[PDB]
UniProtKB/Swiss-Prot annotation, chain A:
Catalyzes the NAD(+)-dependent oxidation of formate to carbon dioxide. Formate oxidation is the final step in the methanol oxidation pathway in methylotrophic microorganisms. Has a role in the detoxification of exogenous formate in non-methylotrophic organisms. InterPro entries: D-isomer_2_OHA_DH_cat_dom, D-isomer_DH_CS, D-isomer_DH_CS1, D-isomer_DH_NAD-bd, FDH_NAD-dep, NAD(P)-bd_dom_sf. Substrate binds at I122, N146. PANTHER family: FORMATE DEHYDROGENASE 1 (PTHR42938:SF9). The lineage of its organism: Bacteria, Pseudomonadati, Pseudomonadota. It is an enzyme of class 1 (oxidoreductase). Keywords: Cytoplasm, NAD, Oxidoreductase. NAD(+) binds at residues 147, 201-202, 221, 256-260, 282, 308, 332-335. This is Formate dehydrogenase. GO terms for biological process: formate catabolic process. Belongs to the D-isomer specific 2-hydroxyacid dehydrogenase family. FDH subfamily.
Curated annotation (Swiss-Prot), chain B:
Catalyzes the NAD(+)-dependent oxidation of formate to carbon dioxide. Formate oxidation is the final step in the methanol oxidation pathway in methylotrophic microorganisms. Has a role in the detoxification of exogenous formate in non-methylotrophic organisms. GO terms for biological process: formate catabolic process. It is found in: Cytoplasm. It comes from Pseudomonas sp. (strain 101). It comes from the Bacteria. The keyword Cytoplasm applies. GO terms for cellular component: cytoplasm. Substrate binds at I122, N146. Keywords: Cytoplasm, NAD, Oxidoreductase. The record marks R282, H330 as: Important for catalytic activity. This is Formate dehydrogenase. InterPro entries: D-isomer_2_OHA_DH_cat_dom (IPR006139), D-isomer_DH_CS (IPR029753), D-isomer_DH_CS1 (IPR029752), D-isomer_DH_NAD-bd (IPR006140), FDH_NAD-dep (IPR033689), NAD(P)-bd_dom_sf (IPR036291). Belongs to the D-isomer specific 2-hydroxyacid dehydrogenase family. FDH subfamily. Its main location: cytoplasm.
Amino acid sequence: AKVLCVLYDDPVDGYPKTYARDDLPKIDHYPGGQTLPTPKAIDFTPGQLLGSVSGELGLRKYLESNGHTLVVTSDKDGPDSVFERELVDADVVISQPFWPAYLTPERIAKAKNLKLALTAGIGSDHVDLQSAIDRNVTVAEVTYCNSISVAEHVVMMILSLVRNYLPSHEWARKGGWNIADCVSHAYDLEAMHVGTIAAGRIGLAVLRRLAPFDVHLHYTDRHRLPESVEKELNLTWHATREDMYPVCDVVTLNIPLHSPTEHMINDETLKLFKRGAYIVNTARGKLCDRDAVARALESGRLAGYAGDVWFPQPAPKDHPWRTMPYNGMTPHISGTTLTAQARYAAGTREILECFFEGRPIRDEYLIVQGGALA
Amino acid sequence: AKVLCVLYDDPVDGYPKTYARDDLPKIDHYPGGQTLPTPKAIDFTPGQLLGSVSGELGLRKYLESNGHTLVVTSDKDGPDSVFERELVDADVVISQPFWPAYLTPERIAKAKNLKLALTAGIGSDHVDLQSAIDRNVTVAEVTYCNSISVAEHVVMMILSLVRNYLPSHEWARKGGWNIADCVSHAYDLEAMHVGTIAAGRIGLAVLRRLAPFDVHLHYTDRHRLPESVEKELNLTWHATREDMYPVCDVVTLNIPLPTEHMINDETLKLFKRGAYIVNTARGKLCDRDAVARALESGRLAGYAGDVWFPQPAPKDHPWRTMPYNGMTPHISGTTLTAQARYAAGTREILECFFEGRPIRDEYLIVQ
């Protein structure tokens, strides 16, 4: 079988020979009881860069020693890409949400051998599920692999925005001091009101991490949490987003998106936010209208905006979110720390081991199986 | 009475006319039950810049309407400074740890009217306590005013170091993308081992905030915590600092912090490869060049903090540009929120002092 794996580029100075640490902290299960990936062996050392082209998710020795071929590339866009060329006979397709190879209906029609579409990470919005069903293609992902990673990124960005960390650090780097210039936009997070639009794996990990900061926690969702959990973390429920925005000092947008309406945060909806509110958006770039946010930060209606998702993606070099006032942006990297890479590389092999050996793939990994959802 | 108050400079662009928000979140007491400052009135709006010379801690109308003198200045260094010249007849001296007016024994000897040395904030290391004791000068501070602020700064700096936030943000700002350059030095904080050198108001606030991240918490101190509290956060006790270093992925130095170059080339050999240090206690707790060398060789994966030696740091201080630093200027306990609290506390203390009523017990260092 031919396995076609799309990964992002190597570092500027080349693939790393040495790393900052020797191993990763021991973790056994996710919050809720789901165990970490359980392949029968790995050919990488946890902590290596696996999501880049030279890392190959640690898969080559496993597949080549079993008679399979592995084609790794970063060229994924357009009909003339390496991906679309190798896709015609590819049995398995692997890519990450951070550098995704889209399986459009057109492309699936061209994939005459396709049997398995594997997401090295979380999310399958790049895969047309209807075409997979019609072609009996299995669609799986490594569920829960980086949910905690995203939650850490969010809490860090909340603190950085409220406390004015990034301009303050620049004063240190440029050789200045300027205490008053640092702190005239700096607040404590304590006792602020923080709300999340979804209480999933990410949203609930964020809620638990914000609690000891003595903030007032709010949330909306499709579906309420048990009042067991609402009691434990002393949460306020809102039936709609719009009911939650005006009471919140900080709003975080994560997945799952109940109603993915593009531009659901725009100039009109931003009138519902308190003056000087903060938004942290890791869900999707087009959830917020690009210029409404930029206007809001330049006018002071928003006191800060941070996130790692953009539109378009990757962002052009003059994207306003790169340099607008009081932004805490990073590239799309939050769920691909070296730690998260070890988990979804292990999960990728566990899925490939189950697939090639004819064993059942984990129930929680499956999105589409044998011609229907799973 | 003449009140001499030293504050830091206004912003480069001038004193602000408008602010990012209209008010501050309501807080009633600190962890432990101590209530926030309770002056009989404040003449400022919570959220204004009060720690700069034009902010004046909101005090001028209060002191001038009562017949007092108020001299505000930012010139505090050397014998020819406004502070040292105005100090000879000063009854009250006020300054913040972030821009401290040092009360040396020489200066205290020159202050023939001095009766109260007030810290707009926490800490009196800039005041020679023996000279204050020998001369019946009261030393007071606004206890607990910014302990939570510092603790937030520490957890924020820990996350930024482990996840490589600042180089990642720099790639975005410069127009790059470079996912692998961002994340080839980025890890999760979950399940790491984190230890603190002191479990005081700050150190214990840091521990409580790290707990839901599923880290393994360690600590040393002069006195153990109650086993009620050691349990709540699954703390591991260490009798000495040295015993704590080798098990820690992250080490934080907090006050009340051998306390002078206790982190040096010999001591750094006790740390795990890829350890992170966050130092908000004092700049000299760490040897300046031993830390930088450790970052250049890869023994340390990150160092962040807001305290330096010397202070303010000269423009070529190595900590400004060394690899994997998360430094800020000395600002962690002077957010607008903390300013509102210790400006109110400063007035509460001055009201008690001039009216002859007892100062709060928890405010007093020397009486």
